[PDB]
Amino acid sequence: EAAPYLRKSEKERIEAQNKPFDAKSSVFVVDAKESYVKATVQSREGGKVTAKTEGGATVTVKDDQVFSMNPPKYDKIEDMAMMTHLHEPAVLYNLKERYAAWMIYTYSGLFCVTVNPYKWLPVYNPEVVAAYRGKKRQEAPPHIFSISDNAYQFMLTDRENQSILITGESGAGKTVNTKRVIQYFATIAVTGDKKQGTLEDQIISANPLLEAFGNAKTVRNDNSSRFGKFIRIHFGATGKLASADIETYLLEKSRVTFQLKAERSYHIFYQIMSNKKPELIEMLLITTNPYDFAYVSQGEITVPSIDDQEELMATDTAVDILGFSADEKVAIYKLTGAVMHYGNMKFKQKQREEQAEPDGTEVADKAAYLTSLNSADLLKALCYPRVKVGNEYVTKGQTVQQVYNSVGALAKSMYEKMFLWMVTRINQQLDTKQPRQYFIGVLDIAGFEIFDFNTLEQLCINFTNEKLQQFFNHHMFVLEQEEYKKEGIDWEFIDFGMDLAACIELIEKPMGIFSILEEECMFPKATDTSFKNKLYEQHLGKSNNFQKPKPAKGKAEAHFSLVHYAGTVDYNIIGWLDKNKDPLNETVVGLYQKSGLKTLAFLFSKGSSFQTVSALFRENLNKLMTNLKSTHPHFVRCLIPNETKTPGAMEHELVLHQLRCNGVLEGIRICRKGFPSRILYADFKQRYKVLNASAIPEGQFIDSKKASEKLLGSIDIDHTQYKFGHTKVFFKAGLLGTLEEMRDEKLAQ
């Protein structure tokens, strides 16, 4: 009643599992509205099988889509984690059975997997939440509350840091549940001690502006955010709660470079550029028309019904809630205005001469005004730069492309900087002379999504995602080996982190794939086709998991085909190489440092210069990864099972692919090799004694081991189907299945 679904019955658990069943009947078949449906063998054939489906028709299917399924005992369990048959549909339908049971909290890895319920339930209500810490995993009903709970007691003794990691889910439920996560942080505060924005509400202070700030529109998602944020929480206290960080991580500058006409821009821009605030628009030296700024214009010209007048008002609401000055903050978004003005800047190339050279432009004068530079200062000092030290020397004649790239780079870097600045004061508003000794953290996205059409940066983020999965895998590898140790057993399995890292390694040698791309970009005035050819020599023979894409529909050309934890995904080339190109000039900020605005010092401040750009983006990740290596990570993966966020029912197929994207699926692929399985003596034998038909006294006249050796002596001798564990018993997925198959067959006879 309290937790009414969440532990649903003693009686019904039995009686459901009591219900009639047969595995050898109960089979997999492939569907137009599920990829797969539970099935019956009508008949079996060479490389096809003859089938009927519970709801639907009789159906004719090849062998490979099929096996008979883990029976009611399995059917009512808590755990994908304790699987006993591995094919995706099993997992999926079963959790769908949770969903029709509405049974919330789902487990694989050692960790819990999440769905926005789209409905009222008082999951929150403290009867569970306060009254107990709860339990380690096996011991209590599944809940995200667990993961926090045990991470605490773990750290409490351990006293080094941990973060909990929450995947995809890129809109409503993701953020709602992050909120509730900090709500449970408040519950931890209440647990620790008890006797100024509220701390969730303090994060809310950030949320609306920051949400506009780095949200983005996917073809398949409509407010989705392509910063990197990471959330930290910090303890000088193990009392009631101590205060928190949200932090600075991979940000996607290239989006400023480009959009397709279906697609839109960093939401800030789109929001501000609406019409409502009468003074700013001219104060901004701006036309309310997006249409003007081609570099802005590149996208889709609106989102029909996300109402940016009110969203403007919300931005005001937040910036005023900053308690930070109007004049700076106005100048600050005005910086962005300048940025879009830079899209207009366009240069021209003279006779008998290669230089790119000026359009003499009110745009530059707007810049001068806003900057408190003079435009001529730009014109001479940038547009033919100076760099030398030890003597000092001047740089002239840039190509059209050189200029265009250069200025875009500057603008982008400036946007970046502005984000970076936001840290300083926003956090300081958050920041406290209450100490921190120790840290617990939150992350939002291991972000991978698909389009029929693709662009490098996205793939790079996907690379980073799988890298995160490296981290997942090798930690599990270690821990599971500890579980081998736990009941006396010796490792027959090798690093998953390494194993899939090899798949990354195809991307990464001391040669990076990215590295060589951006590297060769310095080879000038040449065409991606050149690299195509270099692919075709370099990888296309060699690197097994990468492929020439097959013919397929939807697309003029696709160029790369390679294999991923999510499955296997194929992607395409426009000549964009230069987009990643980073120009630098000292001079630009160098003089801005002179300028009036006094944003500029924080505006302003060996590894590389004007180069290494995607590798820089590696570097940014890399540090993060390094620091995470210190930690214990914790894990949540999160789903819209539905067409929508609605009480309305499942939409399967994206849930399929999300789960492909959510490691549990091929993680369980990885683990099934483990015979990843531990089942306790007493229950097990309490079922199993039957065939031995043997009486020798309980207690240790027989161990469970002995009783096994006898029953096995009737039944099996194997390692792979089973091995002994010191307290609990270990199996091929199939094996429990056959065990109870025996049990029903024997008891019925």
From Swiss-Prot:
Subcellular location: Cytoplasm, Myofibril
Domain Myosin N-terminal SH3-like: 22-71
Sites bearing Pros-methylhistidine, chain numbering: H719
Domain of life: Eukaryota
Modified residues (Phosphotyrosine): Y369, Y404
Residues recorded with modification Phosphoserine: S25, S68, S372, S605
Annotated positions binding ATP: G168, E169, S170, G171, A172, G173, K174, T175
Domain Myosin motor as annotated: residue spans: 75-744
Modified residues (Phosphothreonine): T53, T58, T371, T399, T738
Residues bearing PTM N6,N6,N6-trimethyllysine: K119
Stretches the record annotates as Actin-binding: 621-643, 723-737
Tissue: Expressed in type 2b myofibers in the tibialis anterior muscle (at protein level).
Assembly notes: Muscle myosin is a hexameric protein that consists of 2 heavy chain subunits (MHC), 2 alkali light chain subunits (MLC) and 2 regulatory light chain subunits (MLC-2).
Family: Belongs to the TRAFAC class myosin-kinesin ATPase superfamily. Myosin family.
Role according to the record: Muscle contraction.
Record note on domains: The rodlike tail sequence is highly repetitive, showing cycles of a 28-residue repeat pattern composed of 4 heptapeptides, characteristic for alpha-helical coiled coils. Limited proteolysis of myosin heavy chain produces 1 light meromyosin (LMM) and 1 heavy meromyosin (HMM). HMM can be further cleaved into 2 globular subfragments (S1) and 1 rod-shaped subfragment (S2).
Name of the protein this chain belongs to: Myosin-4
Primary gene name: Myh4
